[PDB]
Symmetry: C2
Subunit: 278 residues, 2 copies
């Protein structure tokens, strides 16, 4: 399957055929020097996997544990409170916390709203999805959406991976996800691994085998100063994918904890430091 091979192909396309945003007055700067941080981009890319391997990069280490913590905060706890994430030892969302400690009506807040009728009760997007995957498998509407048009102005940030659609065919659960934009050096490897974990989780609790995993990206971009590191990274040895052990005893989506996941035999290349933009 291999994520290293697909990722390298998309990166080489951006480097070779990407379009620069030098024409625009960009709002991002390099923190080492205050100069404008420009990117090269391409539109509409897709990565697809058969699930014979965990989609994880071996040419650099992906921060797999943090990826799963963030997934749990959004999908399982359905929280918009950065303090819950701090308690899991995660600090990457601190910059976005509002005066009240939350990120607004974004991400987990959207997955927690009880806005769907089911069995005469009001349930959220997640519980609705869980029920429908088991009881109405052939549905052409198994979708979750974080891009709520009525609440965009109340979000501290708008989500990048904002939707999923699921399909059940012949006992297999297929997942397709979309990101409206992705920084290919820093965000993409993290997001691709993270949603595959979500697919393995839900398939386990709904009773299905793993189908295909498809990850779509609208604006694929890489910052110009990251290009040197990406070129090094593309010449590195690629290892065999590691195994992801997920505790077999978990039967309920809300019972999973960070200790129920383990990556076995994860070999990867040395650390590359990427200049910060923001």
């Amino acid at each position: 399957t291999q994520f290293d091979k697909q990722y390298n192909s998309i990166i080489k396309d951006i480097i070779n055929n990407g379009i620069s945003d030098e024409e625009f007055d960009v709002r991002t700067k390099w923190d080492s020097d205050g100069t404008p941080a420009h990117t090269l981009s391409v539109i509409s890319k897709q990565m697809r996997f058969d699930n014979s391997e965990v989609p994880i990069l071996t040419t650099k280490k992906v921060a797999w544990k943090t990826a799963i913590k963030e997934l749990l905060w959004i999908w399982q706890l359905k929280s918009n409170d950065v303090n819950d994430l701090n308690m899991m030892g995660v600090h990457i969302w601190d910059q976005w916390k509002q005066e009240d400690g939350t990120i607004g009506h974004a991400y987990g807040f959207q997955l927690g709203k009880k806005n769907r009728s089911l069995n005469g009760e009001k349930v959220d997007q997640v519980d609705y999805l869980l029920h429908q995957l088991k009881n109405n498998p052939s549905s052409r509407r198994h979708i979750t959406m974080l891009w709520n048009p009525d609440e965009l102005d109340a979000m501290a940030l708008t989500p990048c991976v904002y939707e999923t659609q699921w399909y059940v065919k012949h006992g297999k659960l297929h997942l397709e996800v979309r990101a409206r934009s992705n920084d290919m050096a820093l965000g993409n490897p993290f997001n691709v691994f993270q949603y595959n974990v979500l697919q393995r989780m839900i398939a386990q609790v709904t009773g299905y085998e793993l189908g295909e995993y498809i990850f779509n990206i609208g604006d694929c971009h890489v910052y110009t100063r990251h290009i040197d590191n990406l070129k090094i990274q593309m010449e590195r040895e690629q290892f065999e994918a590691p195994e992801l052990w997920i505790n077999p005893e978990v039967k309920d989506f809300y019972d999973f904890t960070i200790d129920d996941f383990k990556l076995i035999n994860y070999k990867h290349g040395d650390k590359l430091l990427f200049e910060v933009a923001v």
Copy 2:
């Protein structure tokens, strides 16, 4: 960039590798005899066009005028009233008409909700998008969304082609659209033409040239009794694409009317009758 070529490739893939829904207790049946109407399907397909020609089939006639009428009702009038569509002489939505004459809070209703703050006024998704394409071209969030999670239960039908993402690069306006599901025989040709017309309208009024046009589909299906006719279509002669004249004098999106569009030199194959699935 014949759409005929790309369409025929997808259809062949479905006929050959498609998966049957015979395993499920389908709720659709054939009009002629009441038996269950099953389908073959494939997941996640994509068509891309460079806009050098109008994406329209020539192996059968597409209902181009009706497609533009429904587009204006949803995007320009932003109406959920079937009576408005009947006045333009269109009846394909009558079956979904609720007792108040509307389709609930779907389609046009979502595009007309004043939910975004802009310059001291509350504006809807379409005016917000028009403003942003001109004033914040480089945005990674030029998205419209009809899949509003808070209102799915208030919709008489959930939309098939439910989202768009727009990109502005080097003076060109690219459009990416997604359908969660598409009946490939009856719905896809109509939907693919209809959204390209929207691209041309919007580019004309915002002052950009035409970029790429991408159409993504999640569950791609064809009803089994439609197969023979599709096999016929595939062996038919293909003609050059017609030119689409759009009135050069319209400067405001809200000024376009049906008489501002004319297809010229549209040659296509003879009529094929497809069995109705209720």
